Coordinates of all heavy atoms in Angstrom, one line a residue:
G71 N 106.2 182.6 190.7 CA 106.2 181.2 190.7 C 105.7 180.7 189.4 O 105.0 181.4 188.7
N72 N 106.0 179.4 189.1 CA 105.7 178.8 187.8 C 104.2 178.6 187.6 O 103.7 178.6 186.5 CB 106.4 177.5 187.5 CG 106.5 177.3 186.0 OD1 106.4 176.2 185.5 ND2 106.9 178.4 185.3
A73 N 103.5 178.3 188.7 CA 102.0 178.0 188.6 C 101.2 179.3 188.9 O 100.0 179.1 189.3 CB 101.6 176.9 189.4
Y74 N 101.8 180.4 188.9 CA 101.1 181.7 189.1 C 100.7 182.3 187.8 O 101.6 182.9 187.2 CB 101.9 182.6 190.0 CG 101.3 184.0 190.1 CD1 100.2 184.2 190.9 CD2 101.9 185.1 189.4 CE1 99.7 185.5 191.0 CE2 101.3 186.3 189.5 CZ 100.3 186.5 190.3 OH 99.7 187.8 190.4
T75 N 99.5 182.1 187.4 CA 98.5 183.0 186.6 C 97.3 182.1 186.4 O 97.3 181.0 186.8 CB 99.1 183.6 185.3 OG1 99.9 182.6 184.6 CG2 99.8 184.9 185.5
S76 N 96.3 182.6 185.7 CA 95.2 181.7 185.3 C 95.7 180.7 184.2 O 95.3 179.6 184.2 CB 94.0 182.5 184.9 OG 93.3 182.9 186.0
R77 N 96.5 181.2 183.3 CA 96.9 180.4 182.2 C 98.0 179.4 182.6 O 98.1 178.3 182.1 CB 97.4 181.3 181.0 CG 97.7 180.5 179.7 CD 99.2 180.5 179.4 NE 99.4 179.7 178.2 CZ 99.8 178.4 178.2 NH1 100.0 177.8 179.3 NH2 100.0 177.8 177.0
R78 N 98.9 179.8 183.6 CA 99.8 178.8 184.0 C 99.3 177.8 185.1 O 99.8 176.7 185.2 CB 101.1 179.5 184.6 CG 101.9 180.1 183.5 CD 103.3 180.6 184.0 NE 103.1 181.8 184.9 CZ 104.1 182.3 185.5 NH1 105.3 181.8 185.5 NH2 104.0 183.4 186.3
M79 N 98.2 178.2 185.8 CA 97.6 177.2 186.7 C 96.8 176.2 185.9 O 96.9 175.0 186.2 CB 96.7 177.9 187.7 CG 96.0 177.0 188.6 SD 97.0 176.4 189.9 CE 97.0 174.7 189.5
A80 N 96.1 176.6 184.9 CA 95.3 175.6 184.1 C 96.3 174.8 183.2 O 95.8 173.7 182.8 CB 94.4 176.4 183.2
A81 N 97.5 175.2 183.0 CA 98.4 174.3 182.3 C 99.2 173.3 183.2 O 99.6 172.3 182.7 CB 99.5 175.2 181.6
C82 N 99.2 173.6 184.5 CA 99.7 172.6 185.4 C 98.7 171.5 185.7 O 99.0 170.3 185.8 CB 100.1 173.2 186.8 SG 101.0 172.1 187.9
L83 N 97.4 171.9 185.7 CA 96.4 170.9 185.9 C 96.1 170.0 184.7 O 95.6 168.9 184.9 CB 95.1 171.6 186.2 CG 95.0 172.3 187.6 CD1 93.8 173.2 187.7 CD2 95.0 171.3 188.7
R84 N 96.5 170.4 183.5 CA 96.3 169.5 182.3 C 97.6 168.7 182.0 O 97.5 167.8 181.3 CB 95.9 170.3 181.1 CG 96.9 171.3 180.6 CD 96.9 171.2 179.1 NE 97.2 172.5 178.5 CZ 98.4 173.0 178.4 NH1 99.5 172.4 178.9 NH2 98.6 174.2 177.8
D85 N 98.7 169.1 182.6 CA 99.9 168.2 182.5 C 99.7 167.0 183.4 O 100.1 165.9 183.1 CB 101.2 168.9 182.8 CG 101.5 169.9 181.8 OD1 100.9 170.0 180.8 OD2 102.5 170.6 182.1
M86 N 99.0 167.2 184.5 CA 98.7 166.1 185.4 C 97.7 165.2 184.8 O 97.7 163.9 185.0 CB 98.3 166.6 186.8 CG 99.3 167.4 187.5 SD 98.7 168.1 189.0 CE 98.5 166.7 190.0
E87 N 96.7 165.7 184.1 CA 95.7 165.0 183.5 C 96.2 164.3 182.2 O 95.5 163.3 181.8 CB 94.5 165.9 183.1 CG 93.2 165.3 182.9 CD 92.3 166.1 181.9 OE1 92.7 167.2 181.6 OE2 91.3 165.6 181.5
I88 N 97.3 164.7 181.6 CA 97.8 164.1 180.4 C 98.7 162.9 180.9 O 98.7 161.8 180.3 CB 98.6 165.1 179.6 CG1 97.6 165.8 178.7 CG2 99.6 164.5 178.7 CD1 98.2 167.1 178.1
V89 N 99.5 163.1 181.9 CA 100.4 162.0 182.4 C 99.6 160.9 183.0 O 99.9 159.7 182.8 CB 101.4 162.6 183.4 CG1 102.3 161.5 184.0 CG2 102.3 163.5 182.7
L90 N 98.5 161.2 183.7 CA 97.5 160.2 184.1 C 96.8 159.5 183.0 O 96.4 158.3 183.1 CB 96.5 160.8 185.1 CG 95.6 159.9 185.9 CD1 96.4 159.0 186.8 CD2 94.7 160.8 186.7
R91 N 96.6 160.2 181.9 CA 96.0 159.6 180.7 C 96.9 158.5 180.0 O 96.4 157.4 179.7 CB 95.6 160.6 179.7 CG 94.3 160.4 179.0 CD 94.1 161.6 178.1 NE 94.7 161.4 176.8 CZ 95.2 162.4 176.1 NH1 95.1 163.7 176.5 NH2 95.8 162.2 174.9
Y92 N 98.2 158.8 179.9 CA 99.0 157.9 179.2 C 99.6 156.8 180.2 O 100.2 155.8 179.7 CB 100.2 158.6 178.6 CG 99.8 159.4 177.4 CD1 99.5 160.7 177.4 CD2 99.7 158.7 176.1 CE1 99.1 161.4 176.3 CE2 99.3 159.4 175.0 CZ 99.0 160.7 175.1 OH 98.7 161.4 174.0
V93 N 99.4 156.9 181.5 CA 99.7 155.8 182.4 C 98.6 154.8 182.3 O 98.8 153.6 182.3 CB 99.9 156.4 183.8 CG1 99.7 155.3 184.8 CG2 101.3 156.9 183.9
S94 N 97.3 155.2 182.2 CA 96.2 154.3 182.0 C 96.2 153.7 180.7 O 95.6 152.6 180.5 CB 94.9 155.0 182.3 OG 94.6 155.9 181.3
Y95 N 96.7 154.3 179.6 CA 96.9 153.6 178.3 C 97.9 152.5 178.4 O 97.8 151.5 177.8 CB 97.4 154.6 177.3 CG 96.3 155.6 176.9 CD1 96.7 156.7 176.1 CD2 95.0 155.5 177.2 CE1 95.8 157.7 175.7 CE2 94.1 156.5 176.8 CZ 94.5 157.5 176.0 OH 93.6 158.5 175.6
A96 N 99.0 152.8 179.2 CA 100.1 151.8 179.4 C 99.7 150.7 180.3 O 100.3 149.6 180.3 CB 101.3 152.4 179.9
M97 N 98.6 150.9 181.2 CA 98.2 149.8 182.0 C 97.3 148.8 181.2 O 97.5 147.6 181.4 CB 97.3 150.4 183.2 CG 97.0 149.4 184.2 SD 98.4 148.6 184.9 CE 97.7 147.2 185.7
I98 N 96.5 149.3 180.3 CA 95.7 148.4 179.5 C 96.5 147.7 178.4 O 96.0 146.7 177.9 CB 94.5 149.2 178.9 CG1 93.3 148.2 178.8 CG2 94.8 149.8 177.6 CD1 92.1 148.9 178.3
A99 N 97.7 148.2 178.0 CA 98.5 147.6 177.0 C 99.4 146.6 177.6 O 99.9 145.7 176.9 CB 99.2 148.7 176.2
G100 N 99.8 146.7 178.9 CA 100.8 145.8 179.5 C 102.2 146.2 179.1 O 103.1 145.4 179.4
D101 N 102.4 147.3 178.4 CA 103.7 147.7 178.0 C 103.9 149.2 178.0 O 102.9 149.9 177.5 CB 104.0 147.2 176.6 CG 105.5 147.2 176.3 OD1 106.3 146.6 177.0 OD2 105.9 147.8 175.2
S102 N 105.0 149.7 178.5 CA 105.3 151.1 178.6 C 105.9 151.5 177.2 O 107.1 151.7 177.1 CB 106.2 151.4 179.7 OG 107.5 151.0 179.4
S103 N 105.1 151.6 176.2 CA 105.6 152.0 174.9 C 104.7 153.1 174.3 O 105.1 153.9 173.5 CB 105.6 150.8 174.0 OG 106.0 151.2 172.7
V104 N 103.4 153.1 174.8 CA 102.6 154.3 174.5 C 102.9 155.4 175.5 O 102.8 156.6 175.2 CB 101.1 153.8 174.6 CG1 100.8 153.3 175.9 CG2 100.2 154.9 174.2
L105 N 103.5 155.0 176.6 CA 103.8 156.0 177.6 C 105.1 156.8 177.3 O 105.2 158.0 177.5 CB 103.9 155.4 179.0 CG 104.4 156.2 180.2 CD1 103.5 157.4 180.5 CD2 104.5 155.3 181.4
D106 N 106.1 156.1 176.8 CA 107.4 156.8 176.6 C 107.7 157.1 175.1 O 108.8 157.4 174.8 CB 108.5 156.0 177.2 CG 108.5 154.5 176.9 OD1 107.9 154.2 175.9 OD2 109.1 153.8 177.7
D107 N 106.7 156.9 174.2 CA 106.8 157.5 172.9 C 105.9 158.7 172.7 O 106.3 159.6 172.1 CB 106.4 156.4 171.9 CG 107.4 155.3 171.8 OD1 108.4 155.4 172.5 OD2 107.2 154.4 171.0
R108 N 104.7 158.6 173.3 CA 103.7 159.7 173.2 C 103.9 160.7 174.3 O 103.5 161.9 174.1 CB 102.3 159.2 173.2 CG 101.7 158.7 171.9 CD 101.6 159.9 171.0 NE 102.6 159.7 169.9 CZ 103.1 160.7 169.2 NH1 102.8 162.0 169.5 NH2 104.0 160.5 168.3
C109 N 104.3 160.3 175.5 CA 104.3 161.2 176.7 C 105.7 161.5 177.2 O 106.0 162.7 177.4 CB 103.4 160.7 177.8 SG 103.0 161.9 179.1
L110 N 106.5 160.5 177.4 CA 107.7 160.8 178.2 C 108.9 161.2 177.3 O 109.8 161.8 177.9 CB 108.1 159.6 179.0 CG 107.2 159.2 180.1 CD1 107.8 158.0 180.9 CD2 106.8 160.3 180.9
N111 N 108.9 160.9 176.0 CA 110.0 161.2 175.2 C 110.1 162.7 174.9 O 109.1 163.3 174.4 CB 109.9 160.4 173.9 CG 111.2 160.4 173.1 OD1 112.2 161.1 173.4 ND2 111.3 159.5 172.1
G112 N 111.2 163.4 175.2 CA 111.4 164.8 175.0 C 110.8 165.7 176.0 O 110.9 166.9 175.8
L113 N 110.2 165.2 177.1 CA 109.5 166.0 178.0 C 110.5 166.6 179.0 O 110.2 167.7 179.5 CB 108.4 165.2 178.8 CG 107.5 165.9 179.7 CD1 106.8 167.1 178.9 CD2 106.5 165.0 180.2
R114 N 111.6 166.0 179.4 CA 112.5 166.6 180.3 C 113.2 167.8 179.7 O 113.4 168.8 180.4 CB 113.6 165.5 180.6 CG 114.7 166.0 181.5 CD 115.9 165.1 181.4 NE 115.6 163.8 182.0 CZ 115.5 162.6 181.3 NH1 115.8 162.6 180.0 NH2 115.2 161.5 181.9

C-alpha cells in the first residue's frame, strides 16, 4: 500500500500538515491565491 513504510507514512502525515498550512494562509488573506499557487498548482 502507499502509506506502508516508515518513510511513506511520515510523508503522508506531512502532506496533511502542508495542505492545512496553506488553507490557514488563505483564511487570513481572504483569497485562495496563496493556496492554489503555492500548494494546489501541479499537485494532481
Side-chain angles (χ1 to χ4, degrees):
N72 206 220
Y74 169 75
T75 37
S76 281
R77 189 250 176 263
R78 288 190 290 170
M79 175 82 246
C82 190
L83 290 168
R84 65 138 149 76
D85 292 352
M86 294 175 73
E87 201 209 350
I88 276 164
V89 176
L90 191 58
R91 215 177 86 213
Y92 286 97
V93 158
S94 68
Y95 290 167
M97 191 55 197
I98 211 177
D101 198 56
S102 76
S103 177
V104 61
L105 171 60
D106 48 23
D107 294 358
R108 275 297 110 207
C109 193
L110 295 187
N111 197 351
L113 188 53
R114 175 198 294 116

